[PDB]
């Protein structure tokens, strides 16, 4: 039971329940000290520091404080402002640094003692590009909230150079979370295609706005680059006709995945939820999952390095540490199957960019996997039930044809009667009698209706589109 310590820091509420990242951090070490599949002769202790939000100074103090105790590898907090200094300290004293959020990568930082399990936004964005290309859209529209969003989606932003696209940009107001002005601007804009970028809380809180504005109509097809799309309580929506597509790194096919899910729920829904928020309460979150999977990867790396000790490194002693040199190597070399399956590290910059994300969509029953993807082999979408479940083209033997008309004074009239009548029998005129004769001569199953256009249907030179009869046809 080799004693060893893991630098743990967590920007924290400074009130209320335990830190989500931190509760995950404890869960993993517990599982470590139960199962002997890992570290039979090793049992891992740890140290907890909690520092303020976005306060690099305060951070560095606690970082050094733990290095006084000595640990194996600090697990820096979720924010750039602190991440950067912690990273600098970790290499300045040679100890590995593990990270869990994408941050702004500094332009030319040469230090080489850190990784970051979160998959890079460049590659994510590239997959987004592929997916958009697959639907072959023309006028997508982007919406972020923090400027840092522009930095992440750059690879999408430059795309107007190569393919044929068109792309505005709008920014959520920083405060008031009130897209009513914004969404109204979108509705008058008629921007059917939306990408989002937001912590999924805002995603849920804005979908309700969209529904209240009545945007929820089968015409729009939302896409949410935020990864934990599966936590979304999509229930009031799955009957509205839209499709939401957002990638899931957390591979849920594994049995162990779900098992750990429910146990996490037992000790996490132990922390009471927020019923308003629109979430499947008591569920994994990508960060929490990642902070978990990181513990195993560090475990693997240490599992072959028994010569580890824990030197009480003094920051103000500016000489580095010793064992990290090959230790960081081992970590970099790791390959693992955790809650998100394959995990690797690109040697070039020590950042994970190789991975297997799983496209999903709003299934009318909920949120279900409808394909996969990777950086290497591009969109591998399983075209199943595209035209037939058997995969052989077939046509419903009985007809279910619909007919759409325009009220025309001699041709199509609403059946004038004080008492109501509905179905495909509420109309009368010339075209109605003609349709009746079509039925009498061929035995149709027609349905009569109007188009919201209610005209001949017209070419839309604003986008080359058509309207009404032409669009529906």
């Amino acid at each position: 039971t080799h004693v060893l310590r893991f630098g743990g820091i967590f920007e924290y509420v400074e009130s209320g329940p335990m830190g989500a990242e931190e509760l995950a951090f404890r869960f993993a070490v517990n599982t470590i000290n139960r199962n002997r599949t890992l570290l039979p002769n090793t049992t891992l202790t740890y140290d907890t520091q909690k520092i303020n939000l976005y306060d690099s100074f305060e951070a560095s103090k606690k970082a050094c404080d733990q290095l006084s105790l000595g640990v194996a590898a600090i697990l820096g907090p979720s924010h750039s402002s602190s991440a950067n200094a912690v990273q600098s300290i970790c290499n300045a004293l040679g100890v590995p640094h593990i990270q869990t959020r994408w941050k702004h990568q500094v332009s030319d930082n040469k230090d080489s003692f850190y990784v970051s399990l979160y998959p890079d936004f460049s590659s994510l964005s590239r997959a987004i590009l592929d997916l958009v290309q697959f639907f072959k859209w023309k006028t997508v529209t982007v919406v972020y909230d923090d400027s840092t969003g522009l930095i992440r989606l750059q690879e999408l932003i430059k795309a107007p150079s190569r393919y044929n696209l068109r792309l505005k940009i709008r920014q959520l107001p920083a405060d008031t979370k009130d897209a009513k002005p914004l969404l109204k601007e979108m509705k008058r804009g008629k921007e059917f295609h939306v990408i989002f970028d937001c912590s999924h809380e805002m995603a849920a809180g804005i979908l309700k706005q969209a529904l209240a504005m009545g945007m929820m109509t089968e015409y729009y097809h939302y896409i949410f680059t935020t990864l934990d799309l599966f936590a979304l309580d999509v229930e009031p929506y799955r009957y509205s006709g839209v499709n939401m597509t957002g990638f899931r790194i957390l591979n849920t096919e594994n049995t162990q995945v779900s098992s750990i899910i429910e146990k996490w729920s037992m000790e996490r829904l132990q922390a009471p939820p927020k019923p308003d928020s629109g979430l499947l309460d008591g569920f994994m979150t990508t960060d929490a999952a990642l902070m978990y999977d990181a513990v195993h990867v560090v475990s693997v790396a240490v599992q072959q390095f028994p010569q580890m000790t824990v030197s009480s490194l003094q920051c103000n002693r500016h000489k580095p540490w010793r064992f990290g040199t090959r230790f960081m190597s081992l970590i970099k070399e790791a390959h693992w199957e955790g809650l998100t399956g394959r995990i690797t590290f690109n040697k070039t910059n020590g950042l994970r960019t190789d991975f297997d994300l799983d496209v999903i969509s709003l299934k009318e029953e909920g949120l279900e996997k409808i394909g996969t993807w990777d950086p290497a082999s591009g969109l591998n979408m399983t075209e199943s039930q595209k035209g037939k479940p058997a995969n052989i083209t077939d046509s419903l033997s009985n007809r279910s044809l619909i007919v759409t008309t325009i009220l025309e004074e001699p041709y199509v009239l609403f059946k004038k009667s004080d008492k109501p009548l509905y179905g495909n029998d509420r109309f009368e005129g010339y075209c109605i009698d003609l349709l009746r004769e079509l039925s009498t001569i061929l035995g149709f199953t027609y349905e009569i209706r109007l188009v919201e256009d209610g005209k001949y249907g017209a070419q839309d030179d604003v986008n080359g589109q058509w309207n009404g009869m032409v669009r529906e046809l």
Binding site: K180, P181, K184, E185, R188, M213
Partner: protein, 115 residues
């Protein structure tokens, strides 16, 4: 919807439903007729003190210096600002209140004075 406020040295004009939200889809022309030699003093009573950072459409209150939709444009106002007071001797103010298909507001309250 419109209110004849003619031949009043002063009188009160406001969005219909002034205390509550102004109605939607409303297009009501409001007419100020001042006799010759009279100077028009519009007094506008704002209901809400905050500065909008955006001048957007869907909802506008027009001011015209002479017959509406026809005369030179004075301004198109929106937001939660009270516009500054308007002094013209053109003797005719021709005002329209608009409304969009959703998202109404606190309405507006106005006063006209003639000299």
């Amino acid at each position: 919807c419109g209110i004849w406020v003619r031949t009043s040295n002063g009188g009160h004009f406001a969005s219909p439903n002034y205390p509550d939200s102004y109605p939607p889809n409303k297009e009501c022309i409001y007419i100020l007729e001042a006799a010759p030699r009279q100077r028009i003093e519009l007094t506008f009573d704002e209901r809400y003190y905050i500065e909008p950072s955006f001048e957007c459409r869907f909802d506008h209150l027009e001011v015209r210096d002479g017959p509406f939709g026809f005369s030179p444009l004075i301004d198109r106002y929106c937001g939660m600002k009270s516009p500054a007071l308007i002094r013209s001797t053109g003797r005719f103010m021709w005002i329209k209140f608009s409304s969009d298909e959703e998202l109404e507001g606190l309405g507006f309250r106005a006063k006209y004075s003639f000299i």
